[PDB]
Amino acid sequence: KNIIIGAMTALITPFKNGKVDEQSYARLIKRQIENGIDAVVPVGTTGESATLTHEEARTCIEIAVETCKGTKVKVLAGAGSNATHEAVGLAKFAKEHGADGILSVAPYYNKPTQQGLYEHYKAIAQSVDIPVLLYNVPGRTGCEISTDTIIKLFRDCENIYGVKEASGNIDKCVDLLAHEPRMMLISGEDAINYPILSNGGKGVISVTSNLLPDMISALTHFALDENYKEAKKINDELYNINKILFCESNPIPIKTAMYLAGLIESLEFRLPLCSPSKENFAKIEEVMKKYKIKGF
Amino acid sequence: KNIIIGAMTALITPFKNGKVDEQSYARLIKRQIENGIDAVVPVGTTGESATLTHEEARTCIEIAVETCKGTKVKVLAGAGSNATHEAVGLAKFAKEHGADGILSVAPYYNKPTQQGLYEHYKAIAQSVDIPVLLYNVPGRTGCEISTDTIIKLFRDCENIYGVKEASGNIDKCVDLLAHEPRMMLISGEDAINYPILSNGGKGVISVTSNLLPDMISALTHFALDENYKEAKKINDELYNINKILFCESNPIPIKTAMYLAGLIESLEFRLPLCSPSKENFAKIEEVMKKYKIKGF
Numbered sequence A, B: 001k002n003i004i005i006g007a008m009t010a011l012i013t014p015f016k017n018g019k020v021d022e023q024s025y026a027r028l029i030k031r032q033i034e035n036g037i038d039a040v041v042p043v044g045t046t047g048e049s050a051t052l053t054h055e056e057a058r059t060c061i062e063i064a065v066e067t068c069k070g071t072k073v074k075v076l077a078g079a080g081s082n083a084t085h086e087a088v089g090l091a092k093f094a095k096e097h098g099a100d101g102i103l104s105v106a107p108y109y110n111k112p113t114q115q116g117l118y119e120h121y122k123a124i125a126q127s128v129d130i131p132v133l134l135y136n137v138p139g140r141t142g143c144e145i146s147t148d149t150i151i152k153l154f155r156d157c158e159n160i161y162g163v164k165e166a167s168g169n170i171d172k173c174v175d176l177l178a179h180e181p182r183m184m185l186i187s188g189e190d191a192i193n194y195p196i197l198s199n200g201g202k203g204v205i206s207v208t209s210n211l212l213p214d215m216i217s218a219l220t221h222f223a224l225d226e227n228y229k230e231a232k233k234i235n236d237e238l239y240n241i242n243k244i245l246f247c248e249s250n251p252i253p254i255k256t257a258m259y260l261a262g263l264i265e266s267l268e269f270r271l272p273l274c275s276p277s278k279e280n281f282a283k284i285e286e287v288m289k290k291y292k293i294k295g296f
Ligand SMILES: NCCCC[C@@](N)(CC[C@](N)(CCCCN)C(=O)O)C(=O)O
Pocket: A049, A050, A051, A052, A053, A054, A057, A081, A082, A083, A086, B049, B050, B051, B052, B053, B054, B057, B080, B081, B082, B083, B086, B109
């Protein structure tokens, strides 16, 4: 199987006067390349994929693919949908626009059954050639892809090579890798990056990496080399910022943090997302000064 | 305030060979009108709105408004989105195809804050003239509209006239009606229709109504006319079907029940929605036996 692993970033999408700041986007992706990141994930949840237009989603994949040409950094494009026909289309679009793979979230809101989740992902898997990473975040979708369904898709569809887990469920990650160790388990929960990697996970898709890509990079590569003491040390150091980045729903804190660090020009969200409270803004602003934040 | 209350049916959307069976849709809406229903809710969650085309949604609103012209049956249009710019659009569309009001679900997947939910709904309400009923289903959206947020929206925006609660939280509906008793609290949870009505709720938006519209009608009117004994009597009898209609995610069981009752032609879903298990199929078909099913 073809795979995409290592330290990966769920890219924020900066806005300037309500439009996608394309030059900011490219500069942030380059900031990622130059700080040890192995792959960038455009138009995911952290990128406010829900409120983007298809030309903006398609444009930001193109910006990512183009910025990454000439590097080992791969483009794992966000291409999920709660409608199978749209998820297949976005998989085809990313594949035809140069993405090295796709990250496909479980259908949200319409709560498909385990049988329905299998047929949904098989439809995507059979529709394109690029690797496909399952994305399970039940707290946002209303549904979970069970361990059985994840393993079945990994064994039945060749392009499906693993799953980004944001389940806060270390038991499920044992369960997953204990019955199918050839799968690529990706951490979708920054605070528990090391515990997931330590059990055989082969990478992370991080929100924290947006601000401190060097430390997320170092953590993952320390861990992949089984230097578990150094990997755990960064994990422990990162805990305060890993948590504070979820004082409010992602990506409200990270974009607040990016603005505070001067890495984006404006603190703009598309509704229903909005700037955090004044309290959390102060909490985000304080925890930051305990970390060394890289620039461009 | 202009309001839309009473017994309401979240219409299933029949498919024939992958297309919206237009006549059956109209034929099913007619079955509702002649069975005591006060309003029909097209292209909601129960209508598989997530996997519908704008051309399918638009036609089903048009079919809905046209079939209830001349009766007193209202059209409460499903018009929700996790992107405010998409939700504002659907509100205008629904107003121009003749809908008497819109049901607008809380944004799903992207988990907006209470502030974001206020600005999201304030943007919709300020965009149309027709009544706006908030829809809270945290198990499907990943988010809850707090009681404070609900009441603030009710008091600040003239068309926002209440909320359809599907939280299994009778506590919250006391909280709602005790602090804002002028609000129209609508049941979105069939099994607890009477307990919500018994505390001052003024209607239901029912799944069970698809199969037994005569009994959902009678329950709602008995309760609104303060015949609580007869209202609970139907509620208690309906429990077994009210539960089995969620043996799997709605609208999978109700479409199964509708098909088994011969009220629709094909048992077709749009993916990731799926036919139920053979086990649950026997459970839906068996519980059904016990009720007297209206025909055309
Ligand atoms: N990158 C584009 C994202 C926009 C799509 C959408 N806002 C809503 C998705 C949708 N399937 C659209 C349905 C439109 C009417 N059938 C949904 O709301 O369910 C989401 O996935 O969050």
